[model samples]
Target: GDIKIKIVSGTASSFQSGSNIEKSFDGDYSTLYHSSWSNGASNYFPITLTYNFETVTDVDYLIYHPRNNGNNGRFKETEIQYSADGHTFTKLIDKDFQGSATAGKVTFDQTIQAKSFRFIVKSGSGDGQGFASCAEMEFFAK
Candidate 1:
């Protein structure tokens, strides 16, 4: 049998484009997985998924696409992390995506042998009324 890795988004009860956004597997191609930070405060949102590979000693790639729409585009101070035990996490990419406001794809070069993964949205580029969005999160294993 062929081994396939799946990527699933997280869901929220309710989301506000100008306040708090939601990321979930229930998102469609139009909405995707995203949240808003319109309020005068910082928003911290997270999305997670669990996957079982045929074996944990193989090579794999985690590809993702994030959108920084709204007024400020995608926030600058965003962090992307991953976890194996689903408890402690490790930082993969921690950089600002303000100047690169448009939606783009990011790939992690390192190979990981883990059964679970997670994404955390810390803050945006500006304090204006806007939010960041992610179209999809994909995993490729061979």
Candidate 2:
């Protein structure tokens, strides 16, 4: 089953108003979270999205959906991290994703129990403008 989580503040990276972090888990294909480009410092590489669970959760896999339309913010290199204390995090998996609209099913050999999870994007595909975006993310225990 999928683990339920709530969005939380982590990095100070700027995001578009309607495309906030909440949109990444809204279960809507049309909605997405996009980093803003209001200034030169806004859209940079290594965008990160963090999530906190109401209680401790066991997660082993996830479905990562890119922006439904273009490949503007498609993840190129990503790191799946977890933390039990919600502070110190450890890596669970490192993935090099393709530049496409297809949703990626990210899985690991072992399960992790943590209160916080982070989706860290080191780079993006397309235009290479350093913007990051996602349509949805679903974490699972199995």
Candidate 3:
């Protein structure tokens, strides 16, 4: 079975209590202010959203990017996870975004078909000033 991947941003929902598109999934993800990798305080943080599919063998690539609002150094590392029933999650991409920072498009080449998927931020780099924002997410199907 070929599964197609779809990327959905945390900030897509406009009126879902904790799903505001402007605040990075209602602040579920941490955003860092004017600070550095060593001294900056984390703000928007990170979040993991779930996506359910019929089969678990059609996903090809995962495209992720952050929302750029004229802020400097908003790069953060994130981990990807998979689940069968959205209750128990298994680490698919553990600590994969570590050391790799980007405010633009980032893609994962590995494909894993599961009932659900999530993105988790373990560490980040930024300047302690404002909030870190993420714009969109895309999951590709094979």
Best by lDDT: 2
C-alpha lDDT of all candidate models, in order:
0.46, 0.74, 0.45
Cα TM-score of candidate 2: 0.84
- TM-scores of all predicted structures: 0.56, 0.84, 0.53
Which segments of model 2 are wrong by more than 4 Å? 1-12, 38-43
lDDT of 2 by residue, 1-142 (tens): 4554444434325578878877877778889778775524544666777877766677777778898787678877888888898889998888877665688887878878888788788777666355678888777775
lDDT-wise, the better of 1 and 2 is 2
Better of 2 and 3 by lDDT: 2
Candidate 3 wrong stretches, greater than 4 Å = 1-57, 72-75, 95-110, 125-132
lDDT of 3: 0.45
Worst 10 residues of 1 by lDDT: 18-27
Count of residue pairs whose backbone atoms collide, per candidate: 12, 0, 30
Ranking by TM-score: 2, 1, 3
